[PDB]
Subunit: 506 residues, 4 copies
């Protein structure tokens, strides 16, 4: 997988690919100039015995003292060691790779005053598929997680390779590297930034997108299973409202559903029963979710390319300036935004499941099973979906509204973006479980409409499932079916049915 990186130009689709699979990358030749020039600007400051905070000074007491060169170099190690104070579970390699590539992208923009050779080391680690240990918690939005990553550069910490933990030195050799020594500003360049926060929210974004796509397919099947109407998806309704998300959503439903199906055609005159909101307001509810994840994607798309460390080096003017780009407030809001979409996608789906369980609603046997006097059918699966949908409401509580003061009142407001981002992964597992159950139920219900077929793309969704899970004939161990369905969705089995260009990264 060759990627030739033009720093600051990653697209959301590129980001999804980095997240999904190993990468091979190289910096574009056009990146060298600005990168080498911020180093030269740093080198000049030092050569001219100029004092610059965050460049050649010590801290606090020494924040204006030109720390001797000797202590300057060891100050970088001490920063990284002391800052590597994270805790909790190890991030998986996929997420570690994204963070590494985000850091490379940002440093490579030439505002950080870090040597190209350090950047090249990180790249060597990516290319070698050597992923430094990074613990899940600690950042308030990303000193700790970025400090854990950088440990390996110095020959400290540990890293994963071929799924086994290696010592840093062992790890470095795998990548054809030897331990490095950091120079002025490099410690800060590596530790300051929003790459972990951004990475966490991006994974939430990609999950949110996979689930949107799945939900269009499952909701289409459910519509068919209970003989719902295609009228709610009429373009005229959506154009008259003017909401773009909803207009795009409805277009997706029409594409998947078509004008009619054998199923729909064989439910002749009757269209006298208006469909419940969980079917009929799918464009409106799923469109709102689509708009919401597009808003987040835009913010996160920009942040993936942001120059986020501090202080910034402006070689062109000779200036070094301390600002607040390491504050990940926009990332935090984007994540809280995504929370709303993942929850409402799951909520609308659970009510569709609920409908399907109701023989007064479904025009199907109660709980989707033949001879329910002695068979419980899907009844407890529906309960599982309610439990999962429910959990998402509390999980929806925003993290972007909380802050505690740190660094002795000097970092008196922070974003809490890492917590905001990572709760999204569990919300997505809940909504994924809900959709898997909807998937199972709608194929069961369509099954009961003996011999009848739905549309072309929805029939592919039925075959996808039925190749792993059989029709529900009579009560049997239920959980393995749900497990199966969930893995299918997690593997993107239905994503490909959605039309192109709808979702930010797809």
């Amino acid at each position: 997988t060759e990627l030739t990186l033009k720093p600051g130009t990653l697209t959301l689709a590129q980001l999804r690919a980095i997240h999904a699979a190993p990468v091979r990358l190289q910096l574009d030749a056009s990146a060298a100039p600005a990168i080498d020039a911020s180093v030269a600007c740093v080198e000049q400051i030092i050569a001219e015995d100029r004092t610059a905070y965050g460049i050649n000074t010590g801290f606090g007491l020494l924040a204006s003292t030109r720390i001797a060169s000797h202590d300057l170099e060891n100050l970088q190690r001490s920063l990284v060691l002391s800052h590597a104070a994270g805790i909790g579970a190890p991030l998986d390699d996929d997420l570690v790779r994204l963070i590494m590539v985000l850091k490379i992208n940002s440093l490579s923009r030439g505002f950080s005053g870090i040597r190209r050779k350090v950047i090249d080391a990180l790249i060597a680690l990516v290319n070698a598929e050597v992923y430094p240990h990074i613990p899940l918690k600690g950042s308030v939005g990303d000193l700790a997680p970025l400090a854990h990553m950088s440990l390996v550069l110095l020959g400290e910490g540990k890293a994963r390779y071929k799924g086994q933990w290696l010592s840093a030195t062992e790890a470095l050799a795998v990548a054809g590297l030897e331990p490095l020594t950091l120079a002025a500003k490099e410690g800060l360049a590596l530790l300051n930034g929003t790459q972990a926060s951004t990475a966490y929210a991006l994974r939430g974004l990609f999950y949110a997108e996979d689930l949107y796509a799945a939900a269009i397919a499952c909701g289409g099947l459910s519509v068919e299973a209970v003989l719902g109407s295609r009228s709610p998806f009429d373009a005229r309704i959506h154009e008259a409202r003017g909401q773009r998300g909803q207009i795009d959503t409805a277009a997706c439903f029409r594409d998947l559903l078509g004008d009619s199906s054998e199923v729909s055609l064989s439910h002749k005159n009757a269209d006298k029963v208006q469909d419940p909101y969980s079917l009929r307001c799918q464009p409106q509810v799923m469109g709102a979710c689509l708009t919401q994840l597009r808003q987040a994607a835009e913010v996160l798309g920009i942040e993936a390319n942001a120059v986020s460390d501090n202080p910034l080096v402006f070689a062109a003017e000779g200036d070094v300036i301390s600002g607040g780009n390491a504050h990940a407030e926009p990332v935090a809001m984007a994540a809280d935004n995504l929370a709303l979409a993942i929850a409402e996608i799951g909520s609308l789906s659970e009510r569709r499941i609920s409908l399907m369980m109701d023989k007064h609603m479904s025009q199907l046997p109660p709980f989707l099973v033949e001879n329910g006097g002695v068979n419980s059918g899907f009844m407890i699966a529906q309960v599982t979906a309610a439990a999962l949908a429910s959990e998402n409401k509390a999980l929806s509580h925003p993290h972007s509204v909380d802050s505690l003061p740190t660094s002795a009142n000097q970092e008196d407001h922070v974003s809490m973006a890492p917590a905001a981002g990572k709760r999204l992964w569990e919300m997505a597992e809940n909504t994924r479980g809900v959709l898997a159950i909807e998937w199972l139920g709608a194929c069961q219900g369509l099954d009961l409409r003996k011999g009848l077929k739905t549309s072309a793309k929805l029939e592919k969704a039925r075959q996808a499932l039925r190749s792993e899970v059989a029709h529900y004939d009579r009560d049997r161990f239920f959980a393995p079916d749900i497990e199966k369905a969930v893995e299918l969705l997690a593997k993107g089995s239905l994503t490909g049915l959605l039309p192109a260009g709808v979702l930010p990264s797809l």
Copy 2:
């Protein structure tokens, strides 16, 4: 105030003006065609003894029965009467006017099959400044509140005029109207829609905008009061991150602050103390808030013009279709989105207040007062700001993630957009109180820098306050000062200092 309405074209600035003050409006002649044509389409259906749900049928049992004309007409009254089941405090006239104008705008787009003369009645009521009673609660997202409004059309309910409650009939005469009788589909046309939800969120939007504007001015004063740096607002920092909200925010700070001030110039060499995040990350935090309220404004801007009732009449094709546009999910998310902005604006401000109270941070006397051994100064005001900032965290909990099934499982998923929107008004009162206190504190602190002036626009912010509230010389009754400051902000005293074209409706 003449407004000649081209239906579906209201701008956010027009919406802010309708919200802020009485309107005089007239429909543009180009609206008549489509409006008269949906009526004609309805008239044709009835003339052809065609059955159409939501047009000439009864409900449930009779949902396919062509209800006799006679019962058809009385069905409209009964719908409005039975649907007027709202409760809680009366909306104020300002908000009632916005809802009325939103309903007019939507019906006037010609998809609702309602007579121009009914639309004209609502317009007559607006023009006459006769505002029907509408209670605050009941909608799940807006049958009840729109049904209360429509009562007056029929000569039921009551309405406010010159701030006094009048009977509907008295009210109607003030507007030069007599009670009307509704025709086929008119009841539904009036009661279905998202106008109240939209109106509630729009007020939240306009509040959020006023507060943003105030916060740029107050944060600029606070920066000056504690001798902060202008370096964090350097354009190069914000362009390097790429976030638009933050880029625009920083531009606002530079405009208000300028390159230097007498204050800043007289704090010679020293710039050795990095400013805390509550000053230095203002572009990043306030920019995130700006982006967030721009996302909401876009959704709400579109929704203000939406065709939101049901079923929709498509005269051009002869079709009538039932869809889900009355589902206000996008409005609900937009409001939850705005919640995040109002809270973080207040949180960042309270920490700026906090900083100002700390003589190790502020370079000012503790609690902003001379001889604090016996004077408490601003100490308890700061506590008030903490209480107000705090309340906003719980208030931030999203409403868009909750739903309960209604109408016997037929409306099985709803938005909860009215609750989402109205909590914003109280969040805004909290953040307004916080900013008022920041305002007071920064003018006090600048005062203590004897004779020194800040920038041109920030000096106007100081004079604005000082014309109502005097320097704090020694302990005195504090609450009246805060009261004063709050009313000043609520009157938009600082809004005008912000550069043009930054905020969606300004």
Copy 3:
């Protein structure tokens, strides 16, 4: 209403009476000793030129300086003036009276070193029904609200009398008082404490209790209306679980319901349809709520009698000690606890309403109305109940988990108990609206069981309502009925049906 107060012995029932109506109180003679002795201890310190913090010292810089007597006295006024920095709506007289009586109770315990004559002034104000202005917001848990109350003692602020605002001096004369001058420690004695926090939560408690009582009656009517069973309330079921709240709750249902009714008897054999959880799990759900409000009442009962100011005077030993009793953490948790009860009482009730709307569940006409083809009946009322029930979920978010640092890091953790307590009042208005609608619906449904009577106490609940609201014959303006029902409940119309000794204050 004579109350002769033995300080520290108020009961919850006494507290409900103070809250509900004017009081006439006098201190018991046995209170004089300890009250006069803490003053004497303060007087001795001063007479012996001993330095005591919070007694005869100034603040911060002067926290160890024996401030001259002269400045000592003016320091008390300045504390009260500067601390009166609250904001928002005026508390109503009922709540102001409770706070005043709570302060009197606490000071009268003799640990505060305040003169009996100051205490007597507050008592004079209560007895005269002169209620100082106190604004709703500002405390983080209660300097501001207690400082506003004390203003009037000094002839500052304003007070309400016979529902009109009076100047403090006018107010004082009504009570036969002249402005006072405060002595050493008195300022702190008055301003420190948890009385407002406690008062806010107590009102929440009493509301929660009224609603519990109402819900037993309404749920009993609903059970009857849909021909539910009395079997779920069998004592054996509740004893076998062992939960006390549930055991007591079920006993209440049995008392109100009885072994059988004309209604229940006339629904002969059939008991083949198990009742839904919203009826059948009433003991379990309402019992949990009962336990929860009993836990809160215990904490609040104790806190109503707490010695809560600081520093405390221990005359017996001669010691003065600074502690943290003014921290209202337990009050904050008690309120968050009560939030759960008010929400679940309303949630269970709304589902009972929902059931009643469902002719497949209710054994009643859909939406409780004859000829629903053209009549909507209770359909939109149910929607109102869903909107109100829904709002309570977000409102349930705990305030006790938030804190911001105040007083320049010296009050670095606070309770947020006032916010916790006051949100309960609105939660209670929501649940009250829900129950009013249940009340209306169950009497309507029982009505439809022509001529049949329920039990003795539930028939009184029916007559209570029917004296204000008529049977629903056909569609009519709905909101006035709900308004009526709500006022009935707010007046305690159903409270008296509940057996004695169940609820903490009743």
Copy 4:
């Protein structure tokens, strides 16, 4: 470990031991009578061709049909298979053992009509340390998780033994069992109940208790490290407030702290600086938490012994009754209650950490390190604690206030107690991380008071830590120290210092 079980008499301490380690149990002979008698009552019903719902009937359609014996037996398997529809991670053996023992306890009370031999099988599995697979999610409060457990009884599912998954049949043989066939009511007896919900909250309870205990020790060390006063813990202060939790908490502090220490004695005259609230209000804040966890423990203690299935068999009277004991509302509230305690314990601790980082507060070097110009010391550890404390606020959102309708509107209100309980485990990991950091910091700070010793018990807390983690001399890899400290706490290293009889289960 022999336990001879008297059903319904488990104590909280017994429950903590079952949770912590393997058990060996036997039913007391006095349990046989009522257990054999409910079976006989079931047998009599069947022998008399009496129809009883949930005993010898089929479901829904057949809810009044005496299902043939043959289908009766297979209905039990089908219930268990179809109900085993849970998902998510496998519970660990510890938690599976607790659930099994809770189920045994409840069935053994003789109200369930299940054969002693089935109960004996579960006991055989416990004794053999064979733990059936149970997935984490699915219950709405516990059909799915109890159905997964019961699978193994029938020779389905899988179970863990010596940490390896075994087939059910392999598992059964390890316990000396063969697959069973279930009889009338047994399926329901096994699947209905609140044992998983209760088990989840109990683990939360025990965690909350361990953390309370740790926090008293760490807060005592922090007090000493920054030369705080013992005056806030004076019994007179706590008795004067009257709050029991706080009185008990303060007694704990006095026990651990003592009247004085070498440390405290060597900080001679000065006691002129009042301690911040994070030290001084420890009795008030930790006491509130203690009260809160005592309230939960009481509910959970009772529920551990509850008869929770349905319908219940009352052999004494011959009656079988369907009720709602399987509704775990009280468990859900107890868990939400515990959430508040775990969060506030962590919040108060993080502010104590914060204080310790502030040389204007701590009387220690900034960030607890010598030569901080080039050493960052504990600065980023503090950030980690803020991130962890912060996460707990959103996690605090109550689950007991949410519900969705299941079983086609027949279970229209549910508790969401499993979600409520399990979020507590992660909240406890956050607060544990916070305390570990406090622990580290206070031992570091005391270290800096060269040669000085604190009290007897607090010196043991110092030695406990120092045996794993060395004094912080200069910057080094920080995270391993925190990891170490966390494992120490998780192992109960400080629990034993707390006085006996304070905590419900200890």
